Amino acid sequence: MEFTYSYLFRMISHEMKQKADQKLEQLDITNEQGHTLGYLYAHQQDGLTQNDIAKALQRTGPTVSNLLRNLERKKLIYRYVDAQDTRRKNIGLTTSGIKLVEAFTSIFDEMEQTLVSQLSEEENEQMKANLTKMLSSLQ
Amino acid sequence: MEFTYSYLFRMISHEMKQKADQKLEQLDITNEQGHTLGYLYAHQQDGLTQNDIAKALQRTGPTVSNLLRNLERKKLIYRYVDAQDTRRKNIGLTTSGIKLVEAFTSIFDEMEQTLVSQLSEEENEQMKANLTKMLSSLQ
Incomplete structure (x- = not known):
């Protein structure tokens, strides 16, 4: 069961944006x-x-x-x-x-931490490097 | 210069969605x-x-x-x-x-290929596994 990057990125982006928006509304x-x-x-x-x-x-x-x-x-x-x-x-x-x-700041920080926690220091580093490379190609 | 996952995912998701939408409009x-x-x-x-x-x-x-x-x-x-x-x-x-x-199909396929090309077979595999883990935590 393999999903496209498009799907995965969109899901993640939607989940995080909804979380952020839901909390910003609270801060008015x-x-x-x-x-x-x-x-x-x-x-x-x-x-x-x-x-x-x-x-x-x-x-x-x-x-x-x-x-x-x-x-x-x-x-x-x-x-x-x-x-x-x-x-x-x-x-x-x-x-x-x-x-x-x-x-x-905590809203965006806790969201980052939750994700950073899932991977090792090198896995995080490799991930971001890779996300960067992919985004760069997308221009 | 380190960016948050939120930023990177959002940028990638926006770049791909705009690309897809721009082409779907063409297909009517x-x-x-x-x-x-x-x-x-x-x-x-x-x-x-x-x-x-x-x-x-x-x-x-x-x-x-x-x-x-x-x-x-x-x-x-x-x-x-x-x-x-x-x-x-x-x-x-x-x-x-x-x-x-x-x-x-080609629209979503070429977009996938462009990204898949950037990483090795194990890097792709590791990436998707990791994107999956992160999304799962986001629920």
């Missing part, structure tokens, strides 16, 4: 909001402004601003005085903002 | 029509009636009948006297009907 955030909060989670130590976020997210002014205004309304982010330079304000995560990205 | 048939013509291609030697097709396709009467009526209108299938029993008529593929399923 998008992948755009997730990646935004994520970039903050990762780089807010650098002292981020709206311009920095815009340059990073490849998004326009008011769109970034609407995205930011929505996130601040949900008390997920806040603005604060820069310690190095009091004259300016930076954007940072709230406590609830941090818990959200971590939950957001 | 569905997967339902394809599998129907396919079942005929495979088992018309047995002498198929509308009831046999219905039992095989898990579809209702007029739905099967509409599916059949559409296929005959497109000159993809025809009805003929059974050789063993002249009193009855069977459903069979036309020449254009045969060429269609073969084209339908």
Whole structure:
């Protein structure tokens, strides 16, 4: 009983996407909001402004601003005085903002771990190398 | 530079589905029509009636009948006297009907071959075994 790669990949992709989507709906955030909060989670130590976020997210002014205004309304982010330079304000995560990205991250992380656990360190390595080769041919 | 399985599987699944869909549109048939013509291609030697097709396709009467009526209108299938029993008529593929399923089959076959070619016989075997194990955990 042998199945095509198409079938197997499609089944796996559908099972994982449904799992991810089912959980994102629970968090009431998008992948755009997730990646935004994520970039903050990762780089807010650098002292981020709206311009920095815009340059990073490849998004326009008011769109970034609407995205930011929505996130601040949900008390997920806040603005604060820069310690190095009091004259300016930076954007940072709230406590609830941090818990959200971590939950957001865990969803994709636990899904990865569940799969990684099934194979050895070399089997995982070989697998990804092979998935990479196949995808590359598909272009 | 390591990507998640989710990403890799999704990319591969999207690349293949777009390729398949792009080609099915060209053939102007569905997967339902394809599998129907396919079942005929495979088992018309047995002498198929509308009831046999219905039992095989898990579809209702007029739905099967509409599916059949559409296929005959497109000159993809025809009805003929059974050789063993002249009193009855069977459903069979036309020449254009045969060429269609073969084209339908080649699309999924060439896509499979392109991928199978990238790995050795044991690498392919190991891969599918592993994809199977991972999907099973995903349930």
